[PDB]
Amino acid sequence: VIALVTHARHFAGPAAVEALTQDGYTVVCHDASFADAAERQRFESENPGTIALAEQKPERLVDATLQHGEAIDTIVSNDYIPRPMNRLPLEGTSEADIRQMFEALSIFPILLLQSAIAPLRAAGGASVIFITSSVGKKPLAYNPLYGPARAATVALVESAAKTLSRDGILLYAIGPAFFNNPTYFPTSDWENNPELRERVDRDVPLGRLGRPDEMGALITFLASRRAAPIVGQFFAFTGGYLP
Amino acid sequence: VIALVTHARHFAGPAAVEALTQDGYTVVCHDASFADAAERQRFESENPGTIALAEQKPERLVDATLQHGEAIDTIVSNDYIPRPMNRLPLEGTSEADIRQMFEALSIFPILLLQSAIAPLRAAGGASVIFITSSVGKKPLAYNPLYGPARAATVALVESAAKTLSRDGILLYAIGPAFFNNPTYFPTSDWENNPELRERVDRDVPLGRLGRPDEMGALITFLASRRAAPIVGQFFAFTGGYLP
Amino acid sequence: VIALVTHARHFAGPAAVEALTQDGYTVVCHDASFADAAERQRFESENPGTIALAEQKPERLVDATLQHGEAIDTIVSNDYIPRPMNRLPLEGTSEADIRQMFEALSIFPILLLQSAIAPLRAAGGASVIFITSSVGKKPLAYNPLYGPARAATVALVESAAKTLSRDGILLYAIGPAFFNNPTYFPTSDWENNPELRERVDRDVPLGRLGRPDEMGALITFLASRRAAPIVGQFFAFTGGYLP
Amino acid sequence: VIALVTHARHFAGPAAVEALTQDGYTVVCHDASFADAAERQRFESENPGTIALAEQKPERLVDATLQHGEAIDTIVSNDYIPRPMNRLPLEGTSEADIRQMFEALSIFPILLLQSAIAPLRAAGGASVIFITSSVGKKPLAYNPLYGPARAATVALVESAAKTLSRDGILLYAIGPAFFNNPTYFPTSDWENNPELRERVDRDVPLGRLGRPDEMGALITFLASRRAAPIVGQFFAFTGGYLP
Ligand SMILES: [Cl-]
Ligand SMILES: [Cl-]
Ligand SMILES: [Cl-]
Ligand SMILES: [Cl-]
């Protein structure tokens, strides 16, 4: 049973590869770094049971994954943009940066999803889990460009699900905040940053960052299809920070 | 492991009981019919692993449950109003029916919750899962009193989670629609009533009622605490009808 | 052209009376203090163009108002609870206080609305404007009972609008926060409470409390029926604190 | 006293021009046809008190508008995509069409808003009114691309308002559905399409198309800034179809 995970070295990627591999999936992985054959080999060495794709185009990931299996059971569309770009303000930000924000967080997942429909429908269904952000639903003053691009992909999930769910193709969005992960909250900064630790005590009812295995537990539960009627919505992964 | 499930014979009750007992729980059950001791003996014999309480007051259920075990791991607050009161209109409805709507759907879960905080905190945490309705978030023309009462309890979950999550007491709301259950979508309606399958085809992207085991899968997933960061929010169980 | 404002002395009452009287309305006012006849004549003397009702039951205010005119053009359902109670916690709170929360903020507005439909329909339509709270839509840690009660009435507006709009009976909910009013944010508090000014600088994009005349401007605009297609929704009145 | 209205000949453009001019504004108008000198002269002569711009690039509209007055009081960002591109499906749709959807509905408004910030702040504030769509908040099965692009601009309003409000720059999003307008619901469609009249009867509580003067009343009310604390939110203009 195979899963496709995008941007595997970033954001919720490590968590998704870990939990899905432990669940018995063969995890086929995309990452910008995988254009390099050497980085492909190191990744597979460091992550038993994975396959690293060379393909970089969003519309070609599905065809490239289908080289290593009969069908795709789960796609984790783990879209991200490197820090500090997520905090780019409205004023003075270049048009290139504006377009890149939508390219990485809205156009890339659309082109992926579009390419996926036909093969996934032929296999009788699958799950597509988009990793977005809390600002997909709740706005933040310092994310005035990141927020809009994330909200587009949340709306993509809720609208596209109205039609794809009848094909057995189940779409979901996760909107993390205060989630322990290499892109926005690496374990290295927690101990050194007492403003963060005070921010979490103030704003996160759970009182801690969410753990990689808890993100992994949500992903594997969704991939199992055992609760299919919750298809088509946004799940906050924020320790109670949202709503 | 102890679970308390309220109104066990109705709504989400049977689904919860089947799945929690299958996951190794001892399920302590409340139900109006359990005033009669013979009902209590029959329910227990038909459902291995369950203990039927005689207690009927919402604020005494926790104490009565703690007569059978050291701590409660999960409370399923499975509140409901007999069909067809869920469709009571605004005009011509008695003040007494209006108050009963809030009593069963809004006051009762609050008195339950308030009684549970001290013992659940002292035990190190628990999960408290409120079964509400889709109209807890999205209004429907025929539910102008049922909706308000359900929305209150969804707001209870979202607000009370801000303080209780720090005690390890994890609250959630499930808002079902088109969920195959004896109160609102019994199998008999699916078989007998031509209009229901027509409605589901038009309005439910999944194209079917939600199964009891699928509701059960969600309840036992939440009760495990493996994805604790999703605390404090509303989950649609509608097959894509919401949002 | 007559308007009915409830709890005229508190919350959004003074703003409503002032703006509506300025817009040419004869403002019939309900208030608990009006059970004392001296207070009725003091109120009418201090507020030219008002009528202070003796009536206190919600379901009788409409008939009491039609003693002074042939139709009600606008109802401002200005429900409130005396200040400290909006912060009532779950733990240790008496059943009586819980029930009074719902009585003032959820049952009283329903019983008023129920009583108004037939005369309002007979008169070709009207506007009913419910003054609720920001916590009707966005939860807050310190409002776990006030929140539920307010959310019930916002959902009442959203549900009841689905039928009553066809009668020309236009329902709206306004949800204030940081609104300069005698109940929650008197001008006294702004000068006396440096914490309030810091909190407003931090959390309110507008940077200031909303003015009574701005709340009046919202009310009179809704009462005009000039933008009727926005019927049946919740308007944040928070200086950008919501969403 | 000047306003800028974009795509003046489409969507909410005619409503905004007529109402703003009736209200005493000099309305500077952008439109794709205004590249034709003869179309500019004809529009100006058919619409007394307007000024037609030749400029077509979003980030130059403001400076071109400022050629005619010292300050802009209101900007109506009236963004649209020609029918029936709003119904573009996921499958088979070209990459260029996906990109054009975001260009017209998401990137164009962002580049306009960015260019406006500095001169609007120097004038001590202004109103910026984005005309989006009901699908910016509520998904629809047949708008899986139009929805995401609209949702991004709604999220832009909600996020950008967190900072721009302190400058007196007040942002709002209006989300029409069943709004009588030349692009999506011209009067002739109401006459030629009994399916449309039945859909409105079934789904729109108000029971009719929203009128252009009602959209103009909402725009003109927002432009007055008289109820500034409602800044930074989405207004349904749907006749109760939403929420
Ligand atoms: Cl995160
Ligand atoms: Cl159901
Ligand atoms: Cl207030
Ligand atoms: Cl429209």
Give the whole-angstrom CA distance, residue D13 versus residue D3: 12
What technique determined this structure?
X-ray
- Token couple for A53: 């794709």
Give the whole-angstrom CA distance, residue A133 versus residue A155: 12
- Centre of ligand 3 to C-alpha C188, Å, is 14
Q: C72-78 and C126-131: which strand pairing?
A: parallel
- Token couple for D205: 């509580």
Ligand closest to B179 (CA) is 2
- Token couple for D77: 């960002």
Helix axes D212-223, D13-22, angle to 10 degrees: 60
> Could C238 and D229 be called an inter-chain contact, meaning their C-beta atoms sit closer than 8 Å?
yes
> Is A165 within 8 Å of A231 (Cβ atoms)?
yes
In this complex, the residue of C141, C205, C243 whose CB is nearest that of residue A138 is: C243
Q: Total structural domains in chain A?
A: 1
Give the whole-angstrom CA distance, residue B219 versus residue B14: 12
Distances (CA, A) of C111 to C130, C153, C180, D186: 13, 11, 28, 41
> Is B218 within 8 Å of B172 (Cβ atoms)?
no
D169 strand-pairing partners:
D126
Residue type, D116: A
CATH of the domain at A19: 3.40.50.720
Ligand closest to A133 (CA) is 1
> Could D243 and B141 be called an inter-chain contact, meaning their C-beta atoms sit closer than 8 Å?
no
In this complex, the residue of C179, C206, C231 whose CB is nearest that of residue D165 is: C206
D28 strand-pairing partners:
D4, D51
DSSP state for residue C230 in the 8-state scheme: G
Domain coverage including residue C118: 2-237
Asked whether residue B243 is domain-assigned, the answer is: no
> Is B16 within 8 Å of B219 (Cβ atoms)?
yes
Give the whole-angstrom CA distance, residue A149 versus residue A143: 10
> Is A239 within 8 Å of B229 (Cβ atoms)?
yes
Asked whether residue A223 is domain-assigned, the answer is: yes
Closest CA to C182 of C29, C48, C78: C78
> Could A155 and D162 be called an inter-chain contact, meaning their C-beta atoms sit closer than 8 Å?
no
What are the φ and ψ backbone dihedral angles of C240, each rounded to 5 degrees?
Answer: 90, 5
Q: Which residue of C has its CA nearest to B101?
A: C107
Asked whether residue A242 is domain-assigned, the answer is: no
What are the φ and ψ backbone dihedral angles of C147, each rounded to 5 degrees?
Answer: -55, -60
- Centre of ligand 1 to C-alpha A133, Å, is 7
Helix axes B13-22, B212-224, angle to 10 degrees: 60
Q: How far is C7 from chain D (nearest CA, A)?
A: 22
Helix (H, G, I), strand (E, B) or coil at C50: strand
Q: Is the dihedral of CA D197, D198, D204, D207 positive or negative?
A: positive
> Is C181 within 8 Å of C15 (Cβ atoms)?
yes
End-to-end CA distance of chain A: 35
Give the whole-angstrom CA distance, residue B76 versus residue B55: 16
Task: Tally A–C CB contacts below 8 A.
Answer: 6
Q: Does C124 touch chain D (CB under 8 A)?
A: no
A2 strand-pairing partners:
A26
Helix (H, G, I), strand (E, B) or coil at B129: strand
Q: Does D166 touch chain C (CB under 8 A)?
A: yes
CB-CB neighbors (< 8 A) of D150 in chain A: 155
Task: Tally B–C CB contacts below 8 A.
Answer: 121
- Token couple for A215: 């993100």
Closest CA to C34 of C59, C6, C69, C15: C6
> Could A230 and B207 be called an inter-chain contact, meaning their C-beta atoms sit closer than 8 Å?
no
Q: Does B24 touch chain D (CB under 8 A)?
A: no
DSSP states along chain A: -EEEESSTTSTTHHHHHHHHHHTT-EEEE--GGGGSHHHHHHHHHHSTTEEE-----GGGHHHHHGGGSS--SEEEEE----TTGGG--STT--HHHHHHHHIIIIIHHHHHHHHHHHHHHHTT-EEEEEE--GGGTS--TT-TTHHHHHHHHHHHHHHHHHHHGGGTEEEEEEEESSB-BTTTB-HHHHTT-HHHHHHHHHH-TT-SPBPHHHHHHHHHHHHHTTTGGGTT-EEEESTT---
Asked whether residue B104 is domain-assigned, the answer is: yes
CB-CB neighbors (< 8 A) of B95 in chain C: 59, 111
Closest CA to D154 of D168, D141, D166, D137: D137
- For residues A37-69, one letter each, b for 16 or more C-beta atoms within 10 angstroms of the residue's C-beta and e for the rest, the string is eeebeebeeebeebbbbebeebbebbebbbeee
Give the whole-angstrom CA distance, residue D217 versus residue C226: 6
Q: In what order do the strands lie in the sheet with A234-237?
A: A50-52, A26-29, A2-5, A74-78, A126-131, A169-176, A234-237
Give the whole-angstrom CA distance, residue C230 versus residue A52: 52
D139 membership: H or E segment, kind and range: none
Instruction: Describe chain C by its helix, strand, coil percentages, rounded to 5.
Output: 50, 15, 35
CB-CB neighbors (< 8 A) of B134 in chain A: none
Resolution in A: 1.8
Distances (CA, A) of B202 to B178, B210, C30, C77: 12, 15, 47, 38
Give the whole-angstrom CA distance, residue A95 versus residue A118: 34
Number of Cβ within a 10 Å radius of residue A225: 17
Cα angle, residue D67 at apex, residues D61 and D73 outer, rounded to 5°: 70
Tell me how many helices (H) and strands (E) chain D has: 9, 7
- Token couple for D108: 């164009």
Q: What is the 3-state secondary structure (H, E, C) of A105-162?
A: HHHHHHHHHHHHHHHHHHCCCEEEEEECCHHHCCCCCCCCCHHHHHHHHHHHHHHHHH
Q: Which residue of A has its CA nearest to C137?
A: A243
* Chain centroid to CA C8: 9
Asked whether residue C44 is domain-assigned, the answer is: yes
Give the whole-angstrom CA distance, residue D99 versus residue D106: 10
Return all residues near B114 (Cβ < 8 A) that are at least 6 apart.
B59, C90, C91, C93
Give the whole-angstrom CA distance, residue C104 versus residue B215: 36
Residue with tokens 């940053």: A193
> Is D44 within 8 Å of D52 (Cβ atoms)?
yes
Return all residues near D170 (Cβ < 8 A) that are at least 6 apart.
D125, D126, D127, D128, D161, D164, D222, D225, D228, D231, D232
> Is C19 within 8 Å of C50 (Cβ atoms)?
no
- Centre of ligand 1 to C-alpha A215, Å, is 11
- Centre of ligand 1 to C-alpha D71, Å, is 41
Asked whether residue C183 is domain-assigned, the answer is: yes
Q: Does D88 touch chain A (CB under 8 A)?
A: no
Helix (H, G, I), strand (E, B) or coil at D153: helix
Return all residues near B50 (Cβ < 8 A) that are at least 6 apart.
B8, B17, B21, B26, B27, B28, B29, B43, B44
Give the whole-angstrom CA distance, residue C91 versus residue C108: 25
Q: Chains that contact C by 3+ CB pairs under 8 Å?
A: A, B, D
Give the whole-angstrom CA distance, residue C113 versus residue C58: 9
- For residues C77-86, one letter each, b for 16 or more C-beta atoms within 10 angstroms of the residue's C-beta and e for the rest, the string is bbbbbeeeeb
CB-CB neighbors (< 8 A) of A179 in chain B: 229
Give the whole-angstrom CA distance, residue A199 versus residue A183: 18
> Could D233 and C236 be called an inter-chain contact, meaning their C-beta atoms sit closer than 8 Å?
yes
B148 membership: H or E segment, kind and range: helix B146-164
Closest CA to B235 of B165, B181, B154: B154
Give the whole-angstrom CA distance, residue C235 versus residue C230: 10
Hey, what's the torsion of the CAs at A95, A96, A102, A108, to 10 degrees?
160
Q: D169-176 and D2-5: which strand pairing?
A: unpaired
> Is A223 within 8 Å of A216 (Cβ atoms)?
no
Ligand closest to B211 (CA) is 2
Q: Does D139 touch chain B (CB under 8 A)?
A: yes
CB-CB neighbors (< 8 A) of B217 in chain A: 226-227
DSSP state for residue D194 in the 8-state scheme: H
In this complex, the residue of C139, C141, C243 whose CB is nearest that of residue A139 is: C243
> Is A232 within 8 Å of A172 (Cβ atoms)?
yes
